């Protein structure tokens, strides 16, 4: 039912794909590949702020990545049981959202800047974020980040870890609880399926992605790290 | 009584001040002035990600601006009645959060870039955001953005409007419904008191704010537009 409008790549839409898959929800995708269809999309006025991601779900044309994620999380009970749990989930998700946010521009960076940005991301992961989540798991010694059950915070943390490992395969060295976490969460049926071949999970963005985005939107021609 | 940890200025903490005040909740503030004072915080490790804003409320050390705001909004019934309305509130707040986000670095910009950034913001406001919100009110024939009843989205839009008017006094020129909206929200007792002199509302950030930030966090020395 849900239709995700975006480019054929990760970008800001990937986390939405992750959350939907984790909830075992099947979705379709509409890839923007030409300046024509985009302008036609702006014509219809279905993009409230003239921006994508855009997701058609339950009779709504939702824009704003966080709005879309929040709704999917709440609808499929992955947002906790009370306001207090939701506050923890939002706090944890805020950390990983910042971490993955540093890699959003990577594809558009020059071969030179990519090296600097890459070192930056790894530094942030191992010195700021990983320690923080490692401490949370140890503080309560539970299998999940909150409510002793799977939540959006778990899914978002698993995605961030895999993205960091794509840059440094041994990034989890020195964080045994997170390493166990990674294994456990990956084993969950819906997630295991998304990680398996033939899923709608997108691969690391390449030059074809960078070009398509630059043509359709006519922006990000000079992304600075 | 919730305690807010940040610098003596707007920054990312201002919206939190707005939300608490609108809900009619008094709060205390703790301004960071010395680098050694910040290191003390890190020492106790109260800042999960070594960052501020940080708010102590209901026995929690919440970090991540959006996490804090989502909590305050839901706790004081300013987050809609159901998931659908919440989705609408998040989508709207996403827009004004982006708009105000463009003015976050302004204080650290140069006289050269400030004139550039100022034109960029007013441009985005009048051609992308204000038209969107103006349309919501007209097409739905409502006096409030969601559920035709005060919600966080209304409070976040009023703040954004006032920030744009500080840069261009006649920015709302051409948006009659937003001008009526501005008067309607400002007349709400709690908000009216926050706009009156003597409140906890912070002024536009000045050089003294910038110097302090750079002195405490030791960064943001080269902030490009
Ligand atoms: C650094 C390059 C990587 C950026 C990837 C592009 S995402 C596409 C971009 N959308 C946004 O920036 C949306 C921001 C919005 N706050 C959200 O979170 O959804 C867009 O449509 N932009 C068109 C526009 O702004 O007009
Ligand atoms: C462009 C200049 C504008 C000034 C913004 C400063 S807010 C202070 C800054 N905090 C953040 O960036 C927090 C981001 C976090 N995602 C949130 O929204 O709360 C910090 O603690 N930084 C210290 C650090 O990152 O270690
Ligand atoms: Zn190694």
Swiss-Prot record, chains A, B:
GO biological process: glutathione metabolic process; xenobiotic metabolic process
GO cellular component, one term: cytoplasm
Keyword Methyltransferase attached: no
Assigned EC number: 2.5.1.18
GO molecular function, one term: glutathione transferase activity
Gene3D superfamilies xref list: 1.20.1050.10, Glutaredoxin (3.40.30.10)
Catalysed transformations (reactions): RX + glutathione = an S-substituted glutathione + a halide anion + H(+)
Keyword Transferase assigned: yes
Domain GST C-terminal per the UniProt entry, residue ranges: 82-204
Protein keywords: Cytoplasm, Transferase
Location in or out of the cell: Cytoplasm
Domain of life: Eukaryota
Residue ranges of every copy of the GST N-terminal domain listed in the record: 1-80
Enzyme class: transferase
Residues that hold glutathione according to the record: 6, 51-52, 64-65
Residue ranges crossing the lipid bilayer per the database entry: none
Biological function: Catalyzes the conjugation of GSH to a wide variety of electrophilic alkylating agents. Also involved in the metabolism of lipid hydroperoxides, prostaglandins and leukotriene A4 and in binding of non-substrate hydrophobic ligands such as bile acids, a number of drugs and thyroid hormones. This GST does not exhibit peroxidase activity.
PANTHER family from the UniProt entry: GLUTATHIONE S-TRANSFERASE, GLUTATHIONE S-TRANSFERASE A4
General remark: The variations were found from AA sequencing and imply there are multiple forms of CL-3.
Subunit description: Homodimer or heterodimer (with a subunit from group CL-4).
Family: Belongs to the GST superfamily. Alpha family.
Name recorded for this polypeptide: Glutathione S-transferase 3
Organism: Gallus gallus (Chicken)
